[PDB]
């Protein structure tokens, strides 16, 4: 027996109803700007797949962000470009301003709208209970949008969320791991940061959907209200599921494995053990209690579920009591 198939509970056939060129990124023809419009100012960071810089558009004197891509598969470049162009104009989704290439090196560079970010390891410790609900609602606007457009981000983590706190401005950035959702498709489970990886990734369930992003958002929320970063702190991908099972318990995990007929890796048998489902109160203390409320805990519970089909959708999450104040203040 193989694993039981799964379909997204919402926006299942959005790409099926779209013309193939919408999602067939392999056949996308890139539109190139002029590299001489941009001059690099200073370096911002590095990664495995790129080096990013702050730049100046010399034609309008506007501040931009340049992501000079390291050598990767051209279809992976087309995927990011295609996804960025499809989500252009969407709420709290970074804007791809231009796509340029060096004429000598032949290296592609992605040009982004600039967000005057306040580093998450300095910002978060200053954030109030209202700040957390406000920004969580802003990421949810961006997730419901990309999900309604047939796209799963697959890398939701604090580093990929740009916040200009002065102007209460939020942008969900780095769409290099994003994919298009197609019913029946089996995806790569070696996506996302260890700490933000959903149970589906860790057990090797390949037929996942947008609900992957909801798990990641749940990990992010728990790190914020509890002031514990990272919240699930595994030493590897195997220990990452053990750290989760020590909070959610192994009963719901084995019931999840059962439901979908998941062949669990034998390495897991001896490390998972037997753990009870813990109450959220054991992460509450004098230094975080001002951020923890019964609403926050209820919302968090409804996101962090093994069974991807039982987690809240981004639209269901926006309707939760935790955001009543934010929703009211938005009128
Ligand atoms: C361009 C990308 O997605 N990556 C990436 C981005 C940044 N930093 C910033 C900073 C800012 N504003 C701060 C105040 C200067 N803004 N504003 C908009 C964007 C975008 N898009 C952006 N990115 C750093 C490092 C990387 C490394 C490649 C990743 C490896 N994890």
Swiss-Prot record:
Parent-protein start and end of this portion: 2 to 332 of 391
Organism of derivation: Homo sapiens (Human)
MF (Gene Ontology): ATP binding; Hsp90 protein binding; identical protein binding; kinase activity; protein serine kinase activity; protein serine/threonine kinase activity
Function: Catalytic subunit of a constitutively active serine/threonine-protein kinase complex that phosphorylates a large number of substrates containing acidic residues C-terminal to the phosphorylated serine or threonine. Regulates numerous cellular processes, such as cell cycle progression, apoptosis and transcription, as well as viral infection. May act as a regulatory node which integrates and coordinates numerous signals leading to an appropriate cellular response.
Protein name: Casein kinase II subunit alpha
Residues of the active site: 155 (proton acceptor)
Annotated Protein kinase domain residues: 38-323
Pathology noted in the entry: Okur-Chung neurodevelopmental syndrome: An autosomal dominant neurodevelopmental disorder characterized by developmental delay, intellectual disability, behavioral problems, hypotonia, speech problems, microcephaly, pachygyria and variable dysmorphic features.
Reaction(s) the record says it catalyses: L-seryl-[protein] + ATP = O-phospho-L-seryl-[protein] + ADP + H(+); L-threonyl-[protein] + ATP = O-phospho-L-threonyl-[protein] + ADP + H(+)
Tissue expression pattern: Expressed in gastric carcinoma tissue and the expression gradually increases with the progression of the carcinoma (at protein level).
This enzyme's EC code(s): 2.7.11.1
Entry keyword set: Apoptosis, ATP-binding, Biological rhythms, Cell cycle, Disease variant, Intellectual disability, Kinase, Nucleotide-binding, Nucleus, Phosphoprotein, Serine/threonine-protein kinase, Transcription, Transcription regulation, Transferase, Wnt signaling pathway
Quaternary context: Heterotetramer composed of two catalytic subunits (alpha chain and/or alpha' chain) and two regulatory subunits (beta chains). The tetramer can exist as a combination of 2 alpha/2 beta, 2 alpha'/2 beta or 1 alpha/1 alpha'/2 beta subunits. Also part of a CK2-SPT16-SSRP1 complex composed of SSRP1, SUPT16H, CSNK2A1, CSNK2A2 and CSNK2B, which forms following UV irradiation. Interacts with RNPS1. Interacts with SNAI1. Interacts with PML (isoform PML-12). Interacts with CCAR2. Interacts with HIRIP3.
Chief place where the protein resides: nucleus
Gene: CSNK2A1
Lineage, opening ranks: Eukaryota, Metazoa, Chordata, Craniata, Vertebrata
Region (Interaction with beta subunit): 35-40
